[PDB]
Design a protein around this ligand. Structure first.
Ligand SMILES: Cc1cc2nc3c(=O)[nH]c(=O)nc-3n(C[C@H](O)[C@H](O)[C@H](O)COP(=O)(O)OP(=O)(O)OC[C@H]3O[C@@H](n4cnc5c(N)ncnc54)[C@H](O)[C@@H]3O)c2cc1C
Ligand SMILES: Cc1cc2nc3c(=O)[nH]c(=O)nc-3n(C[C@H](O)[C@H](O)[C@H](O)COP(=O)(O)OP(=O)(O)OC[C@H]3O[C@@H](n4cnc5c(N)ncnc54)[C@H](O)[C@@H]3O)c2cc1C
Ligand SMILES: COC(=O)c1cccc(NS(C)(=O)=O)c1
Ligand SMILES: COC(=O)c1cccc(NS(C)(=O)=O)c1
Ligand SMILES: [Br-]
Ligand SMILES: [Mg+2]
Ligand SMILES: [Mg+2]
Lengths: 483, 486
């Protein structure tokens, strides 16, 4: 069958591109994915990684984990109940999450059923030729051919996949994919990695662990969450520790073996040992290009395996484009969506647009969470002669009373001190992901620190700290920190 | 006894002005207040109304109230416990709030001693003359002079005070002042008024009521929260009703009598009656001008009764200024603070600056809460030829799992459709007050709808809805509502 556009991967970016091309530009569109609903064996499905095994289910599970803190914190406000009756029923959480995800799966199914000129094909998409997508039974390119789709234009939108270190016993470990389907909450779990997925899952597992359970997070480098503001990295380390999570910095698994009872015996490079029920590897995500048979058309890959693209998401092959995680830039759902919309506007609208990958608001749903937008000060200090840091850090009042006195809210604004232009805003504490969104809009409008401190506060909020900082805490002059 | 600046009222506006003058411009500042710490008899104290009997304790108490919802909602996420064992200990909450507020009172005491020039005087400020404030022992002008203060400049910052309707049995009723110190949580309460204080307290009382409890909110007109977005007014009304609060609209107490058991018999204008344990009046706050003796120096008051001021907070009398609730405009702490900061940066900094009373972000800590900045559409529609309204309203997913399906999140953007300029943003739902703060910065920057929709979303959040709206839901054209433009 013949299509204006064939999209390989029915995910965040692929569905934005396919829907826009079909509905805004009246193109005949085919979209291919390996599964119509969430979970094993292929985990991602119609809706993409975010819907099925990412942002959506993880936010529901972090919300669930937050009740451990609410139940404890309620006491400071006079709430009373039988503490010994308290159980975290992980089975109920997983069943609730599975229904929410399946409902989305079903709605996307309905969207393809109800949207003329937008067609879904089930199976494994690869490039036969520069104008032909082949859909096969399995990832094996010798598997049976279900469809051959003639394509004026081809969008690669297959996303990324968890990286598993080729160590002894890798097969006894899981990724985030399986973590979403654990039938029982692990008593002892090792999260491997200092990234958002490791930290977020450490929080989830910490809340739902059975009695006498323990969550351990291991990271090779000295301080979790590289790429984030350094004050926040230190404070979120302290606040995880305070909620009973063991942070093992400068540690990596060398091998995993099964104890006789089937639990996991972990040997860390430092020689050290840990016995756990689950080893969750969250050390990286790699672009999913292996199965695309891109050798058939000579699409240029990086050594890593990302599809190389210009700022308009164009491969070295005309009529073949790539957006989202397969491009191995910013692995965020709204970025994938923005790239897909920008690509379709450019190609089918002749409305030339490229995604701005700077000043993108993002979050970590740690407990407590992070909200951030733009540059951290160390990065700003290499690109700007004079950098000012405005910092406010304090245990909010609700948290003196709650008993979580360790829950310091951190609000930091990084400026170009030459003109006051805000380069970066970094938040740690309850509400941070919600606060940071409209900060994204501020940075698009080249907000200066004077635009924040001249705005009238909303009181009482954590956010008003952003509008209360008149005077730098410290500076960088020619890369050098000065108090 | 000689000062650059004498401030009457050590509140939100008074302290900002006092401390800035001192620490920024090395000026010599006297600040008068009637009380050094919270509670009866004068309720407000060092720190002002917000600290003592306002934003600060209210927010701690609404946070406490929120646990009623969290405890229930936890079950959807698999939390299990003995629901029959749950008790809300009001006495614990009030003791915790009292300790929190006292620590802040003590925080400000340090500030006054730990700061040269800046000195606190205790007692009642009044105007003797253009350049003399007299501190007396009571609010009676005839009471003993504790101090006579010489003033190159006088700031009036005495704030506001609850208005109590002059009905038979008003003495059986309380204001928000007494509500902060009730020894027991009322089983049955009538909150009187449709403003943020009545709505916030209805939520608090609703969470802490003993078994067989009932919270009734009455309002004299048809729909609570006048001045807020209409969609949000109707939605809050529904969401409060869904959480067990009875909203009596078009009803107003005509009198209250004590029943023989100490309970309150409320007779409405309509002839309806209701028995409650507490009648909390929250029908308005009025500026505290009486006690300053303004007739002595001829400071002019408004047809409404607030100190008349120009954009620079200047009275008709040179050297004499007024900020915050005494000016009877926007009664918000951050507005008071902004006015104080501007007045001092003006007069002492030689850097004249005027508070912008437009595009002010504010909140209602209703459950769920309101976050708002700028114009409601009905107001926009009278100023601008063509107004667009962008609206997204849905029960967020977590609240489908939580069982609170009635918690619809409302995001509304109101624009000048001629150029896309955002005139107002109106949010209802968890996190609305936090989301709206940086929206206030956006509006100061004259953000257009396209600045919001071209910004990349943070996912998953409620806030990202603000960056997802490209197409108007409807318009006002020369005042007229319609789905489509001509
Ligand atoms: C645990 C986790 C949490 C995350 N949390 C967040 C978060 O909170 N916020 C956020 O913004 N981002 C988050 N992300 C990242 C976000 O999920 C991704 O950036 C986003 O889904 C990428 O979108 P995409 O279009 O590139 O690909 P995807 O959404 O991954 O879609 C790719 C699709 O292609 C399909 N596919 C792959 N190969 C083939 C093939 N050969 N033929 C057919 N179909 C194929 C897959 O089945 C999949 O459905 C998270 C990711 C993970 C793993
Ligand atoms: C229940 C309630 C909840 C509120 N919630 C919020 C909220 O969440 N957010 C918000 O922004 N605003 C809120 N407000 C409003 C806020 O409290 C006021 O806007 C703010 O306190 C006004 O500050 P001000 O400087 O005008 O005076 P105040 O802060 O009221 O200070 C006035 C001070 O003057 C003193 N005083 C009065 N007369 C004299 C005299 N003659 N001599 C000496 N001292 C005198 C008083 O003791 C008092 O301390 C709330 C108000 C109340 C009542
Ligand atoms: C051999 O390592 C793997 O590829 C491996 C091992 C164990 C588990 C997984 N989970 S997955 C395919 O979902 O990423 C991969
Ligand atoms: C006019 O004042 C009253 O009649 C009255 C009645 C009942 C209570 C109060 N408490 S107050 C002064 O704090 O607002 C005043
Ligand atoms: Br490091
Ligand atoms: Mg179709
Ligand atoms: Mg002093």
């Amino acid at each position: 069958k013949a299509f204006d556009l064939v999209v390989i991967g029915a995910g965040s970016g692929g569905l934005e591109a396919g829907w826009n091309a079909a509905t805004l530009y009246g193109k005949r569109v085919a979209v291919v994915d390996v599964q119509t609903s969430h979970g094993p064996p292929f985990y991602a499905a119609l809706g993409g990684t975010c819907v099925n095994v990412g942002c959506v289910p993880k936010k529901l599970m972090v919300t669930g984990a937050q009740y451990m803190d609410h139940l404890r914190e309620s006491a400071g406000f006079g709430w009373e109940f039988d503490g010994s009756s308290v159980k975290a029923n992980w089975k109920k959480l997983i069943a609730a999450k599975n229904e929410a995800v399946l409902d989305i799966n079903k709605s996307y199914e309905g969207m393809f059923n109800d949207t003329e000129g937008l067609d879904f094909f089930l199976g494994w998409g690869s490039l036969e030729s520069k104008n032909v997508v082949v859909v096969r039974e399995t990832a094996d390119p010798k598997s049976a051919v279900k469809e051959r789709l003639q394509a004026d234009h081809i969008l690669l939108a297959t996303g990324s996949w968890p990286q598993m270190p080729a160590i002894p016993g890798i097969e006894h470990c899981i990724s985030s994919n399986e973590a979403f389907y654990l039938p029982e909450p692990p008593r002892r779990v090792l999260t491997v990695g200092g990234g958002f997925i490791s930290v977020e899952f450490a929080g989830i597992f910490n809340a739902y662990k059975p009695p006498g359970g323990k969550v351990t997070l291991c990271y090779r480098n000295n301080l979790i969450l590289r790429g984030f503001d350094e004050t926040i990295r230190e404070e979120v380390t302290k606040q995880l520790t305070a909620n009973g999570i063991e942070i093992m910095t400068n540690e990596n698994p060398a091998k995993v073996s099964l104890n006789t009872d089937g639990s996991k015996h972990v040997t860390f490079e430092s020689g050290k040992t840990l016995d756990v029920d689950v080893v969750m590897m969250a050390i990286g995500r790699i672009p999913r290009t292996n199965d695309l048979q891109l050798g058939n058309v000579g699409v240029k890959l990086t050594p890593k395996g990302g599809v190389q693209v210009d700022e308009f998401s164009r491969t070295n092959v005309p009529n073949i484009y790539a957006i989202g995680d397969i491009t191995d830039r910013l692995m965020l759902t709204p970025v994938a969506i923005n790239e897909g919309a920008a690509l379709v506007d450019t190609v089918f609208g002749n409305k030339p647009r490229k995604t701005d990958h700077t000043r993108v608001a993002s979050a970590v749903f740690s407990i407590p969470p992070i909200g951030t937008c733009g540059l951290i000060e160390e990065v700003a200090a290499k690109e700007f002669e004079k950098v000012a840091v405005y910092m406010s850090s304090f245990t909010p009042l609700m948290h003196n009373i709650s008993g979580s006195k360790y829950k310091k809210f951190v609000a930091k604004i990084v400026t170009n001190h030459s003109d006051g232009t805000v380069l970066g805003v970094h938040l740690l504490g309850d509400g941070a992901p919600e606060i940071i969104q409209a900060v994204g809009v501020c940075l698009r409008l080249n907000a200066k620190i004077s635009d924040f401190y001249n705005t009238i506060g909303v009181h009482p909020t954590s956010a008003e700290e952003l509008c209360s900082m008149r005077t730098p805490s410290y500076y960088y002059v020619k890369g050098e920190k000065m108090e």
